[PDB]
């Protein structure tokens, strides 16, 4: 069906170009520079055709970017660029080769001719159906070591870069109060003795001469949510006093905000007058209670020492028979520990870690039937009852081609859109105490949900709903033989998938819709003073678990696809290009960063691209023998084995530099910095870091 | 075939009292107290009915046994131990339930009354063929359950015991040098430095207040092997000079000795009197050559600290950027180091483990035709042409029930006699500088071609041999289907080669004819002074790499056969008892330790028991649902995540004890040896270790 993908891509690039448009339009009106350019804000440097400003999104080079926006910023700009280095050469291998035989014809050749102009869809010729044992069986063969080998290489040699970037960054970071710390969980109970004590003697009797001081982790988080609760209290009441300065004449005000005006709160201002000062008072006696609350103090504390070689020392070994007690590990900066999760026992967290795993389940398989919804919607639609006079004004055969193939990506788009933030919810339920580990495991969690559903249960439920479209249930009949002939026409579909997440999505994203929204509205609704647009300012982070599981879906779909249709892969290419430009603009200009670790993350990164090069081997060992092994399993059982083995040895020779950190590094740091500053307090560095946000 | 297992066990439990007999007869003669009590010896403190040897070898509880064998021996004891622990109760719920359901009739009870005394090969009625989806079903899927969390549990309590008897041994463990120095493997090249200013620098600036002294790894092989030709020659000379001295009249002596005296050597004492003399003379120019060889340093040290928190923290951190530069891990104890595989540069340890896998799957593919041959003995030999009229003396029922099921499993002994000393020739071949790894890697060896080879290439090479006795070459035919009435004829088989390779063969382990024999030849031919006897006293460790590997081949038979045939079972306990028995009585008189690793070989032993489980319950998935899934692949589906889970489990909670020093147990002995010995002088007792056996 070229007629859908061609209608959906014209619309999809008038999208994208008219939000360039919008984007270009908004940015040069200067009202709101304070929102399009929050970088040059947090880091003082700034105050107060059309498309150009691609151009110089490439100036300002790699160095001065790590220097400038951080290194988890440009390790994941280098994630999108491995896309680009991975995907050209199998794309223009794969079309020279695989489904057009033209590798050179013409230098310049302005319009093809009758070139799958006609009928793209069915390239189930060989792949699938007709054996050869000849030439294209081979041709695929020869593609997929191609191809495998080509990722592996690339992924090597990126992951070598990558290693070596993050020591130099490490070696030449500014101090920090986390290079000194270690946090140690489980700290076992004690009657006679406090956690203080308990940690003061130990880390005197088993690192004496390097060990500084430790804090101890307060139980604080009623106190931190009487806190935020005021804070909304004051926006509220600051919104409605200024609502009724407006309008001084104005009667009383409403009742309870949403819950259909329950209540009958009348003068609302005095009601939250009398809210606030009851919590305020309530904030106080909770500082007094909790200062001075001896239950409060949690089994687990900061420990800072004298030297990074110290550190690293106690953050890398066993410390007691027991490996449940005292457990070490390197502490996250102030900045990223998530101190509501620093309250749960550590005998709590694994049961926890089963519930997360349970209602993961239970959420990737209860979202089908709205992906069922969708690809029944990427079936033919013969139910016109939904629309049976007025689809929206008329009924055309452009309006079948919309509903058949842009409908179902902004549906799946759409319902994709919380999920993010449901898995984020799910992750921070179960303490993992640093922001880097949350957006992590969220970002794990929904790459898994988003290759087990949206691509696997998408095929199965365009196979299962198209051919066997009303049959009956039926056990014994060897039912995945038709996923040969199935995957094909999931590329149908993947292509306008891609074409609506990718291309329309990354350039409505440069928009920054919501956070431009809630500026203004913030602004008109709740200034109070103007020193306070600043604190308005909040750009978020690069949004690593809702970027990431993205581009590695879009890895996973054009390496499974590449040997079967490279009809898919140059809409990837353009994916992978657009995302770069936009987000290297992102990095420059938004996108403060929450948390500085760097690119600690990079192993995930490459595993899953591991997972999805032996994924897309086994799917095309599967489809290709559809129901003859065609001496074709014993050299596609070849490809997942060596792929495995190329994966772990990229691990034991280049993830030691992302998980170990070798003590001559330290010593070096620890030399230098002594060296240059030979009279530095570091008690009086590192003594008041680590308290609370709370206690200030 | 009863009757097979019956004359056959008739024989063996023969076989095995006679071997008790005479190795009581043995013992009780004097002049060999020598051999048959090698320790005692050793260690000073000894010098100079028929089978109650049993009684005083549980005697002289655990504690005295890990002070006086070492912990290694206790620990291989305990794996003996467990196999009672894991197996006795499996057996009782097995014949309670499964094939028998007589669990109480009488508590005294002398003879069964038919109880499967006709024919209990044929237990195929409904493991493999007939569905029930009511009773028998259910009862192989409860047994898998009862059976699997049984032996989970009680591994798990092992592994829990066996890593606080570690930790306990390790804190009160005499001073060692290997406590505190660790070997640097791939020290980085440099040009106007040498090794040892290296090792030197590097460790002054990385380890500064607790680096003591380094000793350099010297490549003296060709010195070693020169000596090793001279003791060679030494004994040659020695044996031909006392012959002559019993027959003064004699004329000149023999060529080349065994290659079919292809020289002419004449009065060979003469002839080795210079080959003595030249060697000698080359081993004085060899040594004064290598002491003042540059070119004989090889990359790698042996760093001592002052304290043994130093020591784990250098062995247990990464020591450079590079992950493959200054290798730092525990050093072997100077009698354990194998020197060597020293010389061998870590750059080359790779290629040469890839040609131990290329061998070893050359060596265990070959093999499989003498195992094929020990089927075919195994399956009805009906080509009489190899006996035709005496098979040895006369033919009759009891000469074919012997060649059935006595020649097949002397045979697979005998054939897998050498396979031991070639795989630890295959593992020596290829540096792992200390003889516990050795043994450890030899063990895993043998272990992985014992499963795959002896077990699994016999169910098969007797399952294709015997019904598909002589057929075509078909493929396409779902090959895999038979299995599971092609497994119970193979457990008739395996109760024989049990029984010959288990009761018998520790029977005549314990005889110790070769050590005897070796000894007595030595000391009649090879004397030459008194004080040579207790020289040639060498009664050889335990056998880690010969014994473990049989344990766990029975432990995976009798995990398989127990929900399909618990006929098997008693056999195994049998095994397992008399095995320990005669193992502690070694433990207690014989077997001097070669090196003292505190059971770091455990977390093998559990995970080759945990795959054996996991192999157990594939095998009864695809026995059970023959061509019916039957339901129990839902349930059989379970049994191995669980068991990985449970394993996982394990190894998070319990390996840390065994591959991990926690530095707080380094810290407590460092403290309390410096108190008990407060003038100890540390470099004088470290700095002369660690240098080579060659140069004294």
């Given at each position: 069906t070229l007629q859908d993908i061609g209608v959906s891509a014209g619309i999809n690039i008038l999208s994208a170009f008219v939000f360039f448009i919008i984007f270009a339009v908004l940015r040069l009106q200067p009202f709101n520079d304070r929102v399009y350019f929050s970088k040059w804000y947090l880091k003082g440097l700034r105050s107060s055709k059309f498309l150009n400003w691609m151009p110089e999104a490439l100036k300002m080079p790699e160095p001065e970017l790590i220097?400038?926006?951080?290194?988890?910023?440009?390790?994941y700009l280098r994630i999108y660029w491995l896309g680009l280095k991975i995907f050209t050469p199998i794309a223009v291998l794969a079309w020279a080769v695989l489904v057009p035989v033209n590798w050179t014809n013409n230098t310049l050749e302005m319009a093809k001719q009758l070139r799958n102009v006609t009928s793209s869809d069915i390239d189930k010729l060989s792949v699938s159906n007709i054996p050869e044992y000849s030439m294209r069986f081979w041709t695929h063969i020869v593609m997929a070591y191609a191809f495998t080998i080509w990722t592996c290489y690339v992924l090597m040699k990126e992951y070598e870069t990558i290693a070596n970037m993050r020591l130099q960054f490490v070696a030449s970071e500014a101090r920090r109060p986390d290079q000194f710390t270690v946090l140690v969980r489980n700290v076992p109970p004690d009657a006679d003795e406090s956690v203080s004590e308990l940690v003061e003697h130990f880390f005197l009797v088993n690192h004496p001469d390097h060990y500084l001081t430790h804090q101890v982790v307060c139980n604080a988080n009623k106190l931190?949510?009487?806190?935020?609760?005021?804070?909304?209290?004051?926006?509220?009441?600051?919104?409605?006093?200024?609502?009724?300065?407006?309008?001084?004449?104005?009667?009383?005000m409403?009742?309870?905000?949403?819950?259909?005006?329950?209540?009958?709160?009348?003068?609302?201002?005095?009601?939250?007058i009398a809210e606030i000062d009851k919590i305020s008072k309530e904030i106080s006696k909770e500082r007094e209670e909790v200062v001075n609350d001896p239950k409060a103090i949690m089994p687990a504390a900061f420990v800072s020492f004298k030297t990074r070689w110290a550190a690293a020392v106690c953050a890398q070994t066993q410390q007691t028979r027991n490996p449940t007690q005292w457990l070490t590990e390197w502490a996250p900066e102030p900045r990223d520990v998530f101190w509501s999760n620093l309250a749960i026992p550590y005998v709590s967290l694994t049961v926890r870690r089963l519930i997360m795993h349970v209602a993961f389940f239970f959420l990737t398989f209860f979202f089908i039937v709205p992906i069922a919804f969708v690809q029944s919607l990427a079936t033919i639609e013969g139910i016109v009852k939904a629309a049976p006079f007025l689809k929206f004004i008329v009924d055309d055969k452009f309006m079948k081609s919309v509903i058949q193939g842009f409908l179902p990506g902004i549906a799946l788009k759409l319902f994709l859109a919380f999920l993010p933030s449901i898995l984020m919810i799910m992750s921070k339920f179960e303490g993992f105490t640093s922001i880097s580990s949350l957006?992590?495991?969220?970002?794990?969690?929904?790459?898994?949900?988003?290759?087990?559903?949206?691509?696997?249960?998408?095929?199965?439920?365009?196979?299962?709903?198209?051919?066997?479209?009303?049959?009956?249930?039926?056990?014994?009949?060897?039912?995945?033989?038709?996923?040969?002939?199935?995957?094909?026409?999931?590329?149908?579909?993947?292509?306008?998938?891609?074409?609506?997440?990718?291309?329309?999505?990354?350039?409505?994203?440069?928009?920054?819709?919501?956070?431009?929204?809630?500026?203004?509205?913030?602004?008109?609704f709740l200034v109070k003073t103007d020193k306070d647009r600043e604190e308005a300012m909040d750009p978020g982070s690069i949004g690593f678990n809702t970027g990431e599981p993205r581009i590695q879906l879009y890895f996973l779909l054009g390496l499974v696809y590449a040997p079967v249709t490279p009809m898919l892969l140059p809409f990837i290419l353009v994916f992978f290009a657009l995302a770069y430009i936009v987000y290297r603009h992102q990095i420059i200009n938004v996108?403060?960063?929450?948390?500085?670790?760097?690119?600690?993350?990079?192993?995930?990164?490459?595993?899953?691209?591991?997972?999805?090069?032996?994924?897309?081997?086994?799917?095309?060992?599967?489809?290709?023998?559809?129901?003859?092994?065609?001496?074709?399993?014993?050299?596609?059982?070849?490809?997942?084995?060596?792929?495995?083995?190329?994966?772990?040895?990229?691990?034991?020779?280049?993830?030691?530099?992302?998980?170990?950190?070798?003590?001559?590094?330290?010593?070096?740091?620890?030399?230098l910095e002594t060296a240059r500053e030979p009279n530095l307090n570091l008690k009086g560095y590192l003594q008041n870091a680590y308290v609370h946000p709370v206690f200030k």
């Open positions: 220097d400038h926006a951080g290194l988890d910023s440009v390790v931190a949510d009487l806190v935020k609760k005021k804070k909304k209290l004051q926006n509220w009441l600051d919104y409605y006093q200024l609502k009724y300065a407006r309008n001084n004449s104005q009667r009383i409403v009742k309870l905000g949403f819950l259909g005006l329950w209540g009958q709160k009348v003068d609302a201002i005095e009601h939250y957006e992590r495991r969220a970002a794990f969690r929904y790459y898994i949900f988003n290759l087990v559903n949206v691509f696997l249960a998408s095929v199965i439920a365009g196979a299962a709903f198209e051919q066997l479209n009303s049959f009956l249930n039926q056990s014994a009949n060897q039912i995945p033989k038709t996923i040969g002939v199935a995957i094909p026409m999931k590329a149908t579909f993947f292509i306008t998938y891609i074409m609506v997440d990718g291309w329309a999505g990354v350039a409505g994203e440069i928009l920054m819709l919501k956070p431009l929204i809630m500026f203004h509205l913030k602004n008109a996108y403060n960063q929450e948390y500085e670790s760097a690119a600690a993350f990079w192993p995930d990164v490459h595993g899953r691209v591991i997972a999805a090069l032996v994924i897309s081997q086994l799917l095309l060992m599967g489809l290709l023998g559809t129901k003859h092994a065609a001496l074709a399993a014993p050299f596609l059982i070849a490809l997942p084995v060596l792929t495995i083995g190329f994966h772990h040895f990229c691990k034991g020779r280049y993830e030691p530099a992302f998980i170990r950190y070798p003590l001559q590094e330290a010593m070096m740091k620890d030399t």
